[PDB]
């Protein structure tokens, strides 16, 4: 009965179990690294892992693929927006 209860409750794709575990698994990797990275650079050594990733900074450095809005019959020049 317990094992029948076991089988009937496992709806998530048996791999959909695993990768669900993996998503929370790696959060150790990043969470551990950062504090240890914080502490490492806090100890006074500015380690670089290395810089080689082709499309990574395509997100946080620049507008990924920028399309600026078209202009029409009105002046958009003076508009500017606040910060967070």
């Amino acid at each position: 009965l317990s094992e029948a209860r076991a089988r009937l409750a496992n709806t998530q794709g048996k791999k959909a179990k695993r990768k669900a575990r993996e998503k929370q698994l790696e959060e150790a990797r990043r969470l551990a690294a950062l504090q240890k990275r914080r502490e490492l650079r806090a100890a006074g050594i500015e380690i670089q892992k290395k810089r080689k990733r082709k499309r990574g900074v395509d997100y946080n450095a620049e507008i990924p693929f920028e399309k600026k809005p078209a202009l029409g019959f009105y002046d958009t020049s003076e508009e500017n927006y606040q910060a967070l």
Partner: protein, 98 residues
């Protein structure tokens, strides 16, 4: 008298003999460069909103964007020489060029 506020222009006008830079009815002053594209107007005084759909395109583009493009033209005529294919000589020219 040296006109400084455009009210002194009455209906408008610059005083060429008056040694002042006349700015009559918003005249004279170079303004900020704004983004607004040229609010054009047709050959009858209508507001040619064809512009904003034609955004950044040649004049070869035929752009249907008016209501009058939807209305059934009354071309129930078997006769009009408006619609008859180009004479085969022009077709021969197009064929050679192509």
């Amino acid at each position: 008298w040296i006109p400084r506020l455009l009210e002194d222009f009455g209906d408008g006008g610059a005083f060429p003999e008056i040694h002042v830079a006349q700015y009559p009815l918003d005249m004279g002053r170079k303004k900020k460069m704004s983004n607004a594209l040229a609010i054009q107007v047709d050959s009858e005084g209508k507001i040619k909103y064809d512009a904003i759909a034609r955004q950044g395109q040649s004049k070869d583009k035929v752009i249907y964007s008016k209501y009058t493009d939807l209305v059934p033209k009354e071309v129930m005529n078997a006769d009009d020489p408006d619609l008859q294919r180009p004479d085969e000589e022009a077709i021969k020219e197009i064929t050679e060029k192509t």
